[model samples]
Target: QELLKDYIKRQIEYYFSVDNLERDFFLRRKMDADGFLPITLIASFHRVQALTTDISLIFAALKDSKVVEIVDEKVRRREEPEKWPLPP
Candidate 1:
């Protein structure tokens, strides 16, 4: 989502005054991951991994739950907003 991306971008840009090389490197990687992975996938993966020991099982469950479909829909709408109807 745009909001999620905006929040992450703002945090990366503003919240952390990256004066040193190490923090800057970490933030750069975070930005790269933001571009690479869907926000939902990142959030879900973090949540499951933090909550339980069974990463593989949770991954299977998340895949089976059609989370990918939802993420795809969000991305499609975001990338090609003109194809959809009703907006401000």
Candidate 2:
């Protein structure tokens, strides 16, 4: 469970991270108008689900994230003033 939680947190953060976003068209297309991704959708990601289907663990792990924020129960990076808009 702990391992699954870690995977959930790490992978979700990566999805929002600049390094991954530059190439993650699949997830990029999934972003909402405000650029936030739903935890429910994150929970459905293949690797995350392969690690564990118990989404409660995902939520528990994210409870302490420093880079990811919980907006209306969704997940996203905070303050993208420098990293948003797909680069110039």
Candidate 3:
């Protein structure tokens, strides 16, 4: 997971000519099944219905605290729905 995050950071840096990216922004998760796999998560600006031109776009789309919290909650829910109650 760390390697993947490192690579992504490298790409973001190379593309934008920036020196660093927030490491926390590169989320990681583990599956609950047998032989759990480490997963590196990314944000989808589209889910918030924000227009994006590049990585910079994520900044604008997720600037709202509420929107960021909502997205995080949604992603968590999506990751483990079976652990929660099923819809009728």
lDDT of 1 by residue, 4-85 (tens): 3334333322312324222434323433222223334434433333544443443333333311222431211123223222
User: Global CA lDDT of candidate 3, please?
Assistant: 0.28
- Candidate 2 lDDT, 44-77, residue by residue in tens: 8887888777767888877867877876677777
Task: Compare the candidates by lDDT and give the number of the best one.
Answer: 2
Residue-level lDDT of model 3, residues 4-87, one tens digit each, is 334433332232121211121222223222212221223342322232234434333323222121232232223332332322
Clashing pairs in model 2, backbone N/Cα/C closer than 3 A: none
Separately for all candidates shown, the number of backbone clashes (residues 3 or more apart, or on different chains) is: 0, 0, 0
Candidate 1: RMSD over Cα atoms?
Answer: 13.4
- Lowest summed lDDT across 10 adjacent residues in model 3 is found at 15-24
TM-score of each: 0.25, 0.78, 0.22
- Greater TM-score among 1 and 3 belongs to 1
Candidate models: Cα lDDT each: 0.32, 0.73, 0.28
Worst 10 residues of 2 by lDDT: 79-88
lDDT score, residue 71, model 1?
Answer: 42
Pitting candidate 1 against candidate 2, the one with the higher TM-score is 2
Where does model 1 exceed 4 Å of error? 1-46, 69-88
